[PDB]
Ligand binder design. Structure first.
Ligand SMILES: Nc1nc2c(=O)[nH]cnc2n1CCCCOP(=O)(O)OP(=O)(O)OC[C@H]1O[C@H](O)[C@H](O)[C@@H]1O
Length: 244
């Protein structure tokens, strides 16, 4: 095998297309997206390209077709706690993660790459970010869309963090390396962290580091513990409870 990472997800083309159809069927704003054109732009970003030479520019046509206004004050970022974040926005349809946007939805949990100077999709292997190269089709996609998603944020932006991790805030994560640095100080008043337990984890040294970084960008920092994730989701679903 050429690469260290898993290959393209089985029936990736069909999957992307069907996810686009489903998304544009559900969301009114996207009711006039051409899903064939979306797929054309998507594969055009990586097909026939060396999968270690992908650029942010390669994804521009896809970004254009997938342009979407998201309510800027309703953004939930997350790091290393994907499941709860998505369960949260499933209940509180008010709030959006990146994976609730058209492009994030299309790509979530999928792997893809092409081969240099041929039209084939590589279903055998693809570059691993760490072992092979960082400018691969998947990593460059997420870097670009997550930057744009962070730039769209305003007002109070929330981030869900995993408090069972050794690094609750990890500066090397997508959240720490891309999103925190692309929030716009002109628009974003506060970054509020929700530290999810499995103790005042808002006093953890990495949260303090996050606090310092954000403050120095002239954005306010707030932090809250979520001691009981189950009860959290319970109250998100049934919030009028006295118990909430
Ligand atoms: N969002 C996302 N989905 C996938 C996927 O399905 N496959 C490969 N990558 C994926 N990404 C980007 C990488 C997220 C995985 O966690 P990571 O590399 O340690 O960096 P994290 O802080 O955990 O990233 C999650 C944050 O960035 C994303 O924009 C998301 O909106 C969240 O705010």
């Amino acid at each position: 095998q050429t690469w260290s990472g898993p290959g393209t997800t089985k029936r990736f083309p069909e999957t992307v297309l069907a996810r686009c159809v489903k998304y544009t069927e559900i969301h009114p704003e996207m009711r006039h997206v051409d899903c064939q054109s979306v797929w054309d732009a998507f594969k055009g970003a990586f097909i026939s390209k060396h999968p270690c030479d992908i650029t942010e520019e390669d994804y521009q046509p896809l970004m254009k077709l997938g342009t979407q206004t998201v309510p800027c004050n309703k953004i939930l970022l997350w790091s290393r706690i994907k499941d709860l974040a998505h369960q949260f926005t499933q209940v509180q349809r008010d709030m959006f993660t990146l994976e609730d946007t058209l492009l994030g939805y299309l790509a979530d949990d999928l792997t893809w790459c092409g081969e240099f100077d041929t039209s084939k999709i590589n279903y055998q292997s693809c570059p691993d970010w760490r072992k092979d190269c960082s400018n691969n089709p998947v990593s460059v996609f997420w870097k670009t869309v997550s930057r744009r998603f962070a730039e769209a944020a305003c007002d109070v932006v929330h981030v869900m963090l995993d408090g069972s991790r050794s690094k609750i805030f990890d500066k090397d994560s997508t959240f720490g390396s891309v999103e925190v640095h692309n929030l716009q100080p002109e628009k974003v008043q506060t970054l509020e962290a929700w530290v999810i337990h499995g103790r005042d984890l808002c006093q953890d040294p990495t949260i303090k580091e996050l606090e310092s970084i954000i403050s120095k960008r002239n954005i306010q920092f707030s932090c809250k513990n979520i001691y009981r994730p189950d009860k959290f989701l319970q109250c998100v679903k049934n919030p009028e409870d006295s118990s909430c």
